[PDB]
């Protein structure tokens, strides 16, 4: 009983690797009759030939580790390898910050929250790194509005 | 290949002299309100292309199956 043929077939027919195929060891006489891709298909549906289950790879350990990770778990120096830059490029950090600063400055000019002349300055004042983050901008804005209102109330 | 829209225009196609066969397919789908209904596609094989009319309304569907030329071969499902 040499089954190397029928095992090569079943693999192609059941549409899976040779290593996942299973031939019933007690039907050995039976399977030896197969010899044809058609024959085999009886044997698959019949149940005497079977597809083994994919061996299990669970991600559960990593899920758990990434879950804790996003609680800010192991960021400690000892857990770092690449440089600060290699982790999170400065250029990306910059680009993110400006975009936010500009979409802000945009939305304001179009809500009439600021005039054009004032805008044009904070665009230049922004590109030149005068604002750490989005709140710091709106602060200087609030200070510039209350600024031209102490020049207006004393010009009244 | 081509979906036909007009039903007065589809009915000319049904003759056209080059169309030997056609078919009526029945599907079970559900509308945007998530309710089960019956859709019907009229498939007609032209020489060089396939025309299919879609009717979601069941009534104008069932009656249009009587609107077919009797000479023309029809496969139900």
């Amino acid at each position: 009983a040499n089954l190397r043929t029928q095992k090569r077939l079943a693999a192609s027919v059941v549409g899976v690797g040779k290593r996942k195929v299973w031939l019933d060891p007690n039907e050995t006489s039976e399977i030896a009759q197969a010899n044809s891709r058609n024959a085999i298909r009886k044997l698959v549906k019949n149940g005497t030939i079977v597809k083994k289950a994919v061996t299990v790879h669970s991600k559960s350990r990593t899920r758990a580790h990434a879950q804790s990770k996003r609680e800010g778990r192991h960021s400690g120096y000892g857990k770092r390898k690449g440089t600060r830059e290699a982790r999170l490029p400065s250029q990306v950090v910059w680009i993110r910050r400006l975009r936010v600063l500009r979409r802000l400055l945009a939305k304001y000019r179009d809500a009439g929250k600021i005039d054009k002349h004032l805008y044009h300055v904070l665009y230049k004042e922004s590109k030149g790194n005068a604002f750490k983050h989005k709140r710091a901008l709106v602060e200087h804005i609030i200070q510039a509005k209350a600024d031209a209102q102490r020049e207006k109330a004393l010009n009244e | 290949a081509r979906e036909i829209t007009d039903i007065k225009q589809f009915l000319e196609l049904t003759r056209r002299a080059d169309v030997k066969t056609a078919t009526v397919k029945i599907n079970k789908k559900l509308n945007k309100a998530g309710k089960p209904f019956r859709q019907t596609k009229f498939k007609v094989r032209g020489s060089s292309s396939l025309y299919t009319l879609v009717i979601n309304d069941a009534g104008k569907a069932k009656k249009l199956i009587q609107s077919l030329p009797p000479t023309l071969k029809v496969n139900r499902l």
Binding site: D24, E27, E30, N46, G47, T48, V50 | -
Partner: protein, 50 residues
């Protein structure tokens, strides 16, 4: 551990054998009287061609 004998007089199976269950197998070879007759009548014994 193989089978379980229930109060209704019912033997229930084990899940470990699950594919010996779903596996159908060959039926008995059942000879017709025509064939049955002939087989018990046959004295020619063929191993050899050499």
């Amino acid at each position: 551990g193989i089978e379980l004998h229930l109060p209704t007089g019912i033997k229930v199976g084990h899940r470990s054998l699950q594919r010996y269950y779903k596996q159908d197998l060959k039926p008995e070879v059942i000879l017709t009287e025509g064939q049955g007759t002939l087989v018990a009548a046959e004295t020619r014994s063929f191993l050899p061609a050499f």
